[PDB]
Structure 1
Amino acid sequence: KRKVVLAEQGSFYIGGRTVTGPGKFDPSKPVIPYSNEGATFYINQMYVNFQAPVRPRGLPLVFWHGGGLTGHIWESTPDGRPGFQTLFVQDRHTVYTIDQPGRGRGNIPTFNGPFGQLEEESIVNTVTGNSSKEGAWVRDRLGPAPGQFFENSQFPRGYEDNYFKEMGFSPSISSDEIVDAVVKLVTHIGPCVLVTHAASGVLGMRVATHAKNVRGIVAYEPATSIFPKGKVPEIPPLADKKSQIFPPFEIQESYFKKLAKIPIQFVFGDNIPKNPKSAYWFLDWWRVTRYAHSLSLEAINKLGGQASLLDLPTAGLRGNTAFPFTDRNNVQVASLLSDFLGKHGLDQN
């Protein structure tokens, strides 16, 4: 179950740009304390890990963590069971896992001065935002309130601390530059499949419209829907009659139609309510967000696409959280990903 045979493995940095401070660098002057004087800084580069099996079969997979996460979530579950990285190397795919710009081993662009500030220029905001444990508990649908689990939950109970410890803030790097890094990676890899999650869902869709090497997308519980510009459907507010879901991302129709040329699957876990739930904001948020994604997939299909929505309970998997790939049944979730890859020949050479 745990053994892994790698023809090769490693990591590298890709993407990003440079910014420079004022003045010149004099090697005779004290280098420490570090100074912006004469400085070149590499910023917004992304970290990439790869593991290649012996005799790979089919396209490499690029696993793209959700918001505030890192490639760790594809390596192991919080209770230490194998993650999708191991599972799909065993399934004979070369596997890439990334830490996007601003997360984990990706760059956090800060310098000598207030966070994110290079002299008078603000590269990212000094004021940060970050979810609490409580916010993440309900966002991920462990249960309706912090410390409470749904009866059917597939969460690895007892490993809560390990789970929340993987989560953190993201600096205000432009989403354009995050997409740019992954487009450059896709150019480097060749034909591949993007496997996204939550906040990276919309980013992966954007990458596909810029990179024909993306031959398929599987998105686990994507957080932001995408529509052709000017063509966002009517989407209701939340049950509290004042909140809304994340504003849908709009792209030019000519780019949106590129999503119709590849197989795309959105995967949702359990315990998303069918009816308005004003008492549980993030449960109600998921209800309307999943609805919006269903309309997004229909728009892709009306343009000739191959887009589908997989509710895991309809496949007989009950209780999954918003991280199905680290839940107790993640081997069965991986089986369904293998099925999708096989259906579209993405597991053949």
Structure 2
Amino acid sequence: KRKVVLAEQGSFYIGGRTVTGPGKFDPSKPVIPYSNEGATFYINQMYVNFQAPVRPRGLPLVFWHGGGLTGHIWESTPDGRPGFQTLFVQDRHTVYTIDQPGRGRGNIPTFNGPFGQLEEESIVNTVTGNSSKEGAWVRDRLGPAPGQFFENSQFPRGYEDNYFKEMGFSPSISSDEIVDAVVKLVTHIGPCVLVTHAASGVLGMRVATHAKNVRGIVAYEPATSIFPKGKVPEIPPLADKKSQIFPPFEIQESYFKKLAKIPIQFVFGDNIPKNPKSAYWFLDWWRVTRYAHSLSLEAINKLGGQASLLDLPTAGLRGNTAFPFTDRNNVQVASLLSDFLGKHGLDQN
């Protein structure tokens, strides 16, 4: 159960670009304090870790953390149980885990000067945003309010400090450049499966439309829905009559159609309400967001697709949060992922 046998492991950087400061670099002049003079900076590169089993079977999996997270969430649960990285190497797949540009070991583009600014150019915004513990608690559906847990909870209660410590801010790197780095990784790896989460859901759908090597997608609790341009369906506002879900991403139909060529599964945990819930903003947000995803999957299927929505409670798993792959039943969640890979032959050579 904890033992893992690796034919090889390692990490590397991929993607990104360079930006430059003014002037020329003189090696005879004091190098410290650092200057933008004569400077070349590498920005927006992505960190990638890989672990390959002996005699892998089927396609490599690329695990893509959600918003404000890192590859840690696939390594271990907050209470130190094996994450999906270990579980899937044991299941004979080569496993890639990434820290996308702007997160963890990915690049945070800043220089000498106010955060994100290279002389007169704003690479990323100096003003940041970041969730609180309280905002994350309700976002991830630990309970309806901070400190509270849903009755059926699979959260590793007692490890709240570990869990919230894994979360942080993201600088304003364009989503285009985040997608670009993962497209480059997919080109490097070859045929593979993307396993996404929350904010990376929409990004992985975009990658698949740019990269035929994506042979399947499993998206845990995706945060933003995707539709063909001009064909976003009517989506209701939230129960507070004022808020809405995240504006759906729209792509050209030629690209959207590529989503119909591969198996796609969206996976949702528990405690998303059926009915409007004005007292709990994020619970209601999830209700309408899941609804929008159901319509997005239907649009894919009408174009010939193989898109499905898996509600974990319907599979007999109760109490999952928005991070089902780190919950107490994450081994059963992993079993359902293995089932999907087996159904489509993505676990065979």
Q: CA deviation at 1:93?
A: 0.1
> Please, what is the CA RMSD of the aligned residues?
0.1
Where does structure 1 lack aligned partners over 5 or more consecutive residues?
A: none
Q: What SS class does the counterpart of residue 227 from structure 1 fall into?
A: strand
Q: CA deviation at 1:258?
A: 0.1
CA–CA distance in 2 between the matches of 1:5 and 1:294?
A: 39
Q: Deviations over 1:159-195 (max 9, x none)?
A: 0000000000000000000000000000000000000
Alignment of 1:92-103 (within 5 A): 92-103=92-103
CA–CA distance in 2 between the matches of 1:331 and 1:246?
A: 31
Q: CA deviation at 1:281?
A: 0.1
Q: What SS class does the counterpart of residue 260 from structure 2 fall into?
A: helix
Q: Which residue of 2 aligns with 1:243?
A: 243
Q: Deviations over 1:200-259 (max 9, x none)?
A: 000000000000000000000000000000000000000000000000000000000000
Q: CA deviation at 1:104?
A: 0.1
CA–CA distance in 2 between the matches of 1:3 and 1:161?
A: 26
Q: Deviations over 1:33-67 (max 9, x none)?
A: 00000000000000000000000000000000000
Q: What SS class does the counterpart of residue 179 from structure 1 fall into?
A: helix
Q: CA deviation at 1:135?
A: 0.1
Q: What SS class does the counterpart of residue 30 from structure 1 fall into?
A: coil
Q: CA deviation at 1:292?
A: 0.1
Q: CA deviation at 1:7?
A: 0.1
CA–CA distance in 2 between the matches of 1:107 and 1:257?
A: 32
CA–CA distance in 1 between the matches of 2:83 and 2:65?
A: 12
Q: CA deviation at 1:75?
A: 0.1
CA–CA distance in 1 between the matches of 2:151 and 2:182?
A: 38
Q: What SS class does the counterpart of residue 259 from structure 1 fall into?
A: helix
Q: What SS class does the counterpart of residue 148 from structure 1 fall into?
A: coil
CA–CA distance in 2 between the matches of 1:257 and 1:146?
A: 41
CA–CA distance in 2 between the matches of 1:150 and 1:304?
A: 38
Instruction: Report how many residues are paired.
Output: 349
Q: Which residue of 2 aligns with 1:127?
A: 127
Q: What SS class does the counterpart of residue 19 from structure 1 fall into?
A: strand
Q: TM-score, normalised by structure 1?
A: 1.00
Q: Deviations over 1:111-142 (max 9, x none)?
A: 00000000000000000000000000000000
Q: CA deviation at 1:264?
A: 0.1
Q: What SS class does the counterpart of residue 163 from structure 1 fall into?
A: helix
CA–CA distance in 1 between the matches of 2:67 and 2:141?
A: 15
Q: Which residue of 1 aligns with 2:230?
A: 230
CA–CA distance in 1 between the matches of 2:348 and 2:306?
A: 19
Alignment of 1:117-156 (within 5 A): 117-156=117-156
Q: What SS class does the counterpart of residue 245 from structure 1 fall into?
A: coil
Q: What SS class does the counterpart of residue 320 from structure 1 fall into?
A: coil
CA–CA distance in 1 between the matches of 2:153 and 2:122?
A: 43
Q: TM-score, normalised by structure 2?
A: 1.00
Where does structure 2 lack aligned partners over 5 or more consecutive residues?
A: none
CA–CA distance in 1 between the matches of 2:4 and 2:156?
A: 23
